[PDB]
Amino acid sequence: MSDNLTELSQQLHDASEKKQLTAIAALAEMGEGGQGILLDYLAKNVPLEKPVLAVGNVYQTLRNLEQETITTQLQRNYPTGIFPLQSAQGIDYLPLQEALGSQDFETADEITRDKLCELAGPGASQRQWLYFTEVEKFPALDLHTINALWWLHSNGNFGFSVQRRLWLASGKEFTKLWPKIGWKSGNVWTRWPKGFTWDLSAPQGHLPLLNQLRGVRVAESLYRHPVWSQYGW
């Protein structure tokens, strides 16, 4: 047992950020010894000064074991998660992190729409859509925090940064991007969203949702926002 653990541990620490995930999955299933190695790795790499996907996968893989002991220990040691919940405008992202850590993407998606409205300010509360002019004025730090959380808790498959990359690969053509991320034309709402896939079986880039009731302008403004380049997304 010790041989594999040592090998797995060495992979987790030193292999390329491509083979780390493989070792994390195996360690999780190596009982207390493997989970212990995962826990020590977190302790040595948290809090994060930059989003590091392996750290998010280590934390989330441990949460996904759904063991009271492990979850409780993680709550005690990382009460606000593994990424500083920074805001430039007094926004509280703890409930968003908590929903993501519990893998409740539907609630995380609702909280995220509520936070973008909170950021937009006055007369956006409870609104089911943003205006592109509100998006252009969002602070970069908050969008970085929101995106980092989505990304770190979805093995890098969810997040506006992911949508933006697919958008760039689509030649910036929304008609090609939408089928790629699973947002069917005409599946738009005025009161509540329906027909989406609020779990990881969804396509890469599927969440967070951007209502297309008003067309592509808000998404374009968001993907063109300076935060992505600014923070290396």
Author numbering: 1 to 233
Excerpt from the publication:
Here we report a 1.78-Å resolution crystal structure of Synechocystis GUN4, in which the porphyrin-binding domain adopts a unique three dimensional fold with a “cupped hand” shape.
To better understand the porphyrin-binding mechanism and Mg-chelatase stimulatory activity of GUN4, we determined the crystal structure of a GUN4 homolog from the model cyanobacterium Synechocystis sp. PCC 6803 (hereafter referred to as Synechocystis 6803) and refined the three-dimensional model to 1.78 Å resolution. The crystal structure of SynGUN4 reveals a two-domain protein linked by a 12-residue loop. The C-terminal domain of SynGUN4, the GUN4 core domain, appears to have no currently identified structural homologs, as indicated by a lack of any structural matches from a search of the DALI server. The helices adopt a concave shell shape resembling a “cupped hand” on one side of the domain, with the back of the “hand” facing toward the N-terminal helical bundle. The buried surface within the concave section of the “cupped hand” is highly hydrophobic. Taken together, the NMR data and the crystal structure strongly suggest that the porphyrin binding region lies within the pocket formed at the intersection of the α6/α7 loop and the “greasy palm” of the GUN4 core domain's “cupped hand” region.
